[PDB]
């Protein structure tokens, strides 16, 4: 009576100066013929979804929603927001003041405005909303996904879908760049045919529908050829290409150099710089150039607090208003500590972009990524003012980090990753939020066992159980109570996971089928090397039998393709095997 529900991202200021009130059938709808284009089409939308009635003109009584910005000059707006504005704020920014009957919603640009709405959106409920007071903008300027990875590209459908669920959570940037295009690289000097060109024409528009910069990257590092009349036919295949892209409707254009055996730094940069120069200066109304360089992590830019041969000619030939993009200390690394960014953004004396390798999983598919921004610096923005994900090849799955990468991004200083990462689970599933959350808590840790790791450790509160478990059973003390609560907590894996089986939609049961049968798996395995324990009271015949299971359950789990939980369930059971309790 009434509550605030979840949001993300968290708004920069939000308070609750009201017990909120329901919005009528009908509502009294103002401003719409000034405020944004795209914020109002939004608005009609959600309307529409929620039986919920414009007043052809006032009264009753109807609920009072207006809206614009603050060039946009509008009285009822002023007397509506009764004290706060939106105009002293970034770019994105807005302001919302659900005044008891009253909701004001006025963003700095157009941009604040529609994320005013989305706001908005998230704030009803059931007709309910609460009165709070509002003031937000992001922390970083550009926030989204680089669809960078190897392996099946998203489908045409996957992207549309993605694109909106940015809108909503405030993300504003989608770089295009999938490895296995063949367009994109394998074959960049080529024209995408007539129906991916259509295609792309939707994700375009679909992009700015919902304030998502649509960025179109080529990466033509494998093949490209930079001397004489060589360079000059490949360099006009790039403008050629950026043309067509141009005279679709984007404004935006990353090139890439990462992953290639060519170390030509002046070369790279030469490109590029050319590139700025022909085609984003002499177009007018095209953001800045975003590139990576063959060197973009730390280990591969820097040595002894120095930049590397190719990072320094790279750094000091490439022009001061493109974008560099680097990955953090490694490729795929737990942290980018402050230090870091510093250490980077230095060298290129700019603030930088990171390209950050998480939920990605093409380097080890077996696993599902499942676990919030983890280890990126709640400081970073001092260095960085371009931050995009690379997720995995499982659209559907990836919201989960994405949705937390949203929060982090837009309101970097109050990121609680546990909090994050609950909210995400809880606003994505609804009635099987829990059960996900019991699944997915074990598909957060990301390791490939050699050069690639990153995330949240898998389940922590179980892995602390487990430790003191091996504690008490070594030191020789009682641990009844713990291994029942043990019990309850492996029986309480395979339930979650069989009625997230059974109930899951489908979109996201495909992604995850195999992982849920190898974590139902794994905890039957754990739930036989506990069996396999209690067999202290010095019982040959349970032990063996249990003994045999647990050891079976163990194979299944890593014979399979899927992989889950490592360190925690796997992983008790292999502990659970070699802790001799024969002995006397
Ligand atoms: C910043 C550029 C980047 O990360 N490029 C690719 C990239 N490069 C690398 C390291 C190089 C590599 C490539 C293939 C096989 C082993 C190692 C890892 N990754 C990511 C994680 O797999 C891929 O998704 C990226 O597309
Ligand atoms: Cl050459
Ligand atoms: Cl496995
Ligand atoms: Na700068």
Not at 528 to 543: F, G, H, K, R
Request: proline share 4%; hydrophobic share 35%; aromatic share 10%.
């Amino acid at each position: 009576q009434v509550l605030v529900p979840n949001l993300n991202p968290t708004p920069e200021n939000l308070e609750v100066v009201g017990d909120g009130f329901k919005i009528t059938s009908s509502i009294n709808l103002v401003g719409e013929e000034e405020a944004d284009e795209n914020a109002v089409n939004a608005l009609r939308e959600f309307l529409t979804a929620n039986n919920i009635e414009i007043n052809s003109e006032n009264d009753p009584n109807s609920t009072t929603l207006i809206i614009g910005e603050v060039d946009d000059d509008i009285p009822e707006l002023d007397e509506a927001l009764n004290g706060t504005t939106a105009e002293n704020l970034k770019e994105e920014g807005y302001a919302l003041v659900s005044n008891d009957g009253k909701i004001a919603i006025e963003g700095k640009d157009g941009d604040g405005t529609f994320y005013g709405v989305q706001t908005f959106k998230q704030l009803v409920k059931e007709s309910n909303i609460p009165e709070v007071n509002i003031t937000d903008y992001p922390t970083v300027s550009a926030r989204g996904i680089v669809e960078g990875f190897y392996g099946t590209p998203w489908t045409h459908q996957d992207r549309l879908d993605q694109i909106k669920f940015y809108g909503e959570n405030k993300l504003n940037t989608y770089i295009y760049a999938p490895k296995d295009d063949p367009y994109h690289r394998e074959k960049w000097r080529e024209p995408y045919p007539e129906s991916e060109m259509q295609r792309m024409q939707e994700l375009i528009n679909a992009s700015a529908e919902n304030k998502v910069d649509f960025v179109f990257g080529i990466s033509p590092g494998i093949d490209i050829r930079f001397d004489g009349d060589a360079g000059e036919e490949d360099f006009n295949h790039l403008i050629t290409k950026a043309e067509s892209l141009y005279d679709m409707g984007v404004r935006s254009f990353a090139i890439y150099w990462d992953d290639i055996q060519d170390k030509s730094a002046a070369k790279h940069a030469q490109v590029l710089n050319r590139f700025n120069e022909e085609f984003v200066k002499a177009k007018g109304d095209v953001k800045p150039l975003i590139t990576v360089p063959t060197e973009y992590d730390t280990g591969a830019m820097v040595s002894n607090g120095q930049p590397r041969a190719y990072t320094r000619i790279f750094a000091e030939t490439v022009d001061p208003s493109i974008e560099v993009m680097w990955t953090g200390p490694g490729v795929v690394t737990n942290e980018i500590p402050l230090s870091d960014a510093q250490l980077i953004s230095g060298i290129y004396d700019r603030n930088m972009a990171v390209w950050w390798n998480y939920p990605v999983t093409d380097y080890f598919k077996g696993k599902l990524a499942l676990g919030p921004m983890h280890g990126l610096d709640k400081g970073l923005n001092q260095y960085v003012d371009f931050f995009t994900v690379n997720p995995m090849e499982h659209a559907e799955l990836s919201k989960i980090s994405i949705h937390t990468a949203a929060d982090y991004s837009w309101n970097m200083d109050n990121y609680d990753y546990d909090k994050a990462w609950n909210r995400a689970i809880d606003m994505l599933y609804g009635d099987l939020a829990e059960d996900m959350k019991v699944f997915a808590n074990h598909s957060t840790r990301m390791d490939n066992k050699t050069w690639a790791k990153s995330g949240r450790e898998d389940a922590p509160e179980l892995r602390a159980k487990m430790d003191e478990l091996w504690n008490k059973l070594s030191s020789k003390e009682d641990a009844s109570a713990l291994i029942e609560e043990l019990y309850g907590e492996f029986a309480r894996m395979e339930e979650a996971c069989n009625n997230l089986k059974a109930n899951l939609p489908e979109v996201a049961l495909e992604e995850c089928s195999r992982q849920l049968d190898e974590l139902i798996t794994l905890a039957q395995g754990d739930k036989a090397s506990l069996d396999m324990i209690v067999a202290l009271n010095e019982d040959t015949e349970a032990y063996e039998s249990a003994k045999e299971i647990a050891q079976n359950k163990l194979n299944t789990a890593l014979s399979s393709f899927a992989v889950i939980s490592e360190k925690v369930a796997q992983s008790f059971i292999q502990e659970a095997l070699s802790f001799d309790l024969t002995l006397i």
